[PDB]
């Protein structure tokens, strides 16, 4: 057991840890950040994303 107490100094106090693993993979992606899409155009020179 850790036995955590209010009187403990920093380093003996409890910390909550969350680890987010990411996969930047060649596979189809499902979790995208909050961006909006634009119309698709063809046969033009564009900056695409």
């Amino acid at each position, epitope marked *: 057991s850790y036995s955590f*107490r*209010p*009187t*403990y100094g*920093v380093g003996h106090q409890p910390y909550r840890v969350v680890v987010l693993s990411f996969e930047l993979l060649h596979a189809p992606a499902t979790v995208c950040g909050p961006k909006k899409s634009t119309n698709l155009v063809k046969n033009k020179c564009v900056n695409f994303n």
Partner: antibody, heavy 117, light 109 residues
Framework: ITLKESGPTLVKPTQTLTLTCTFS??????????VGWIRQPPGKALEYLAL???????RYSTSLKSRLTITKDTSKNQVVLTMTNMDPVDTATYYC???????????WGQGILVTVS | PVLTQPASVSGSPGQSITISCTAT?????????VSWYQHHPGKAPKLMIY???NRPSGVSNRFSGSKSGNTASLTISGLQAEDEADYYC?????????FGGGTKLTVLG
């Protein structure tokens, strides 16, 4: 966020004192929140008695550990503290208060005066 | 393992009053969770300061505090005639929590 107290005000020597605290406006089943008891005998400072946490963890003052028992019923928002072998010297006002870490006790009730005789 | 306080403090309204509370043990550890209460006779104790220097809601900005070493201080600025109460300090120790002896404030006039 209120806490009310009820129970005996007069107890005979060597008998057992039972006090019930009923609270409303909050739950005691949430993390970081518990309910504890404090007493104040005349002319003296506040004395810690007992504390029960949301997970039914029960802690007591080291000098009264053998005399106090604290239990709770989360369906009625009630906490009950029993103190055995009441001494004639155990005359004090008892208080029910909400327990948290960053602030030890708050939302103190008005308290109940108990005299042993 | 006892919190030590002065028996009483006093001064005129409008003046600054300091109420001290000092630990007498190392059991307090970080001593970073000091609470102060204002107790009026016939009424439930009210929390004025917590975590050394923070205020609860419903508390006048005249009340503030700080720590130095293992000693905490409660400062009452702009002293009012309504501030006559028994002030208590509280903190954690290794197996329990403690309350201070209590300091009686008197307002002069």
């Amino acid at each position: 966020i209120t806490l009310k107290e009820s129970g005996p005000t007069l107890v005979k020597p060597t008998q057992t004192l039972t006090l019930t605290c009923t609270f409303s406006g909050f739950s005691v089943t949430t993390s970081g929140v518990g309910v504890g008891w404090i007493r104040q005998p005349p002319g003296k400072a506040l004395e810690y008695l007992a504390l029960i946490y949301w997970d039914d963890d029960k802690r007591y003052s080291t000098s009264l550990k053998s005399r106090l028992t604290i239990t709770k019923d989360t369906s009625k928002n009630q906490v009950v503290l029993t103190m055995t072998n009441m001494d004639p010297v155990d005359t004090a006002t008892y208080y029910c208060a909400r327990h948290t870490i960053p602030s030890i006790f708050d939302y103190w009730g008005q308290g109940i005066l108990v005299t042993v005789s | 393992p006892v919190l030590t306080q002065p028996a009483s403090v006093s001064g005129s309204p409008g003046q600054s009053i300091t109420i001290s509370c000092t630990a007498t043990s190392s059991d307090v550890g970080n001593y970073n969770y000091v609470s102060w209460y204002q107790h009026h006779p016939g009424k439930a104790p009210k929390l004025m300061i917590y975590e050394v220097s923070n205020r609860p809601s419903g508390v006048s900005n005249r009340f503030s505090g700080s720590k130095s070493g293992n000693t905490a201080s409660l400062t009452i600025s702009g002293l009012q005639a309504e501030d006559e109460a028994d002030y208590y300090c509280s903190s954690y120790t290794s197996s329990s929590l403690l309350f201070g002896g209590g300091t009686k404030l008197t307002v002069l006039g």
